[PDB]
Amino acid sequence: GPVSVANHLGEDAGHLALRRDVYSGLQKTPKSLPPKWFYDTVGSELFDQITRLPEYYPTRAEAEILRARSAEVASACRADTLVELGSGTSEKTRMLLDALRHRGSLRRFVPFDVDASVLSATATAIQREYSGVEINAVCGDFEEHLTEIPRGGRRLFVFLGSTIGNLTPGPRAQFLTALAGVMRPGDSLLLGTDLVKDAARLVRAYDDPGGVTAQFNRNVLAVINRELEADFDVDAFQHVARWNSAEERIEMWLRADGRQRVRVGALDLTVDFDAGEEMLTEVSCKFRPQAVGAELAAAGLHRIRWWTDEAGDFGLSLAAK
Ligand SMILES: O=C(O)[C@H](Cc1cnc[nH]1)n1cccc1
């Protein structure tokens, strides 16, 4: 089947994004940075390791549900088109493509991510594995290009791994409304959400003893050093995995050991950390089963299936327009 890659991000859309977020976030109280900057190539290789740590259940837990329920997903949604908000490199992507193909209905695949080079490699791979699938890959972001996803057929939009947990409730409803807004009736969304559980287990999942997560968190300082010509003393920031009980969310902070004075050249800006000051680099919202379905409803989607792993750790929702 034919490939297409359509690119809607400027050649430097990523750099200007990085300059804006760092400039704004290094000047607020407390300092905060978006988590999307974790995922350069070094960072992406660290995230590949996190998914295989014993402490980090979410990848395994979702995998278990999908290894069991992918057929039922394909049966209930009847889609001929799989749209992934994500790069399409997962094993779980092949689970869902397998289900639609086994159902005799796999006609089209639409990966939707921001790195065109990842999309082009994904399309090549999928096009070799699945004869007779059209791979319409889209390079864009959620804030402006969800309308660039192709029309027609019955579409299953997929957004796994509790990625939506990276969105606090304000931006989260703003995303679900936009997505449901581009969905046609008969389309359906598959959404993974990590569930509230024992806080001791939540905190260990985000601070593994060897510190693979610690390097992942600190890696944000390396990306800023390199792409904005800053001088973070990366070794003098400490990984801190916090449980925010009232918002029911994990938080990833960097605590500054000793007063730091960092200068980001490309921005012509100097920031200051007091000794022990902590910067927010991620939130990882955990969910309750009723609150997920209710939130889907606010956006105009009606959950028809909810699915849990054998242990109750992770939830997969299937909702229709
Ligand atoms: O929330 C998560 O556990 C991860 C990020 C992360 C893993 N360990 C520390 N941070 N994730 C998954 C989708 C989007 C972010």
Numbering used by the authors: 1 to 321
Quote the study on this structure.
EgtD, an S-adenosylmethionine-dependent methyltransferase (AdoMet), catalyzes the trimethylation of L-Histidine to initiate EGT biosynthesis and this reaction has been shown to be essential for EGT production in mycobacteria and for long-term infection of murine macrophages by M. tb. Synthesis of EGT by Mycobacterium tuberculosis (M. tb) is critical for maintaining bioenergetic homeostasis and protecting the bacterium from alkylating agents, oxidative stress, and anti-tubercular drugs. Multiple X-ray crystal structures of Mycolicibacterium smegmatis EgtD show that EgtD possesses a Histidine binding domain and a Rossmann-fold domain, which affords ordered substrate binding of L-Histidine and AdoMet, respectively. In this work, library screening and structure-guided strategies identified multiple classes of M. tb EgtD inhibitors that bind in various regions of the enzyme active site.
The obtained crystals were subjected to X-ray diffraction experiments and X-ray crystal structures were obtained for M. tb EgtD with HD2, HD3, and HD6. HD2 forms primarily polar interactions with the histidine binding site residues of EgtD. Specifically, HD2 forms a hydrogen-bonded interaction between an ordered water molecule, positioned by the Thr213 side chain and the backbone carbonyl of Ala205, and the basic nitrogen atom of the imidazole moiety. As with L-Histidine in published EgtD structures, the carboxylic group in HD2 forms hydrogen-bonded interactions with Tyr206, Ser284, and Tyr56. This compound is commercially available as a racemic mixture of L- and D- HD2 enantiomers. As expected, these binding modes closely resemble that of L-Histidine with the minor exception of the α-carboxylate moiety of HD3.
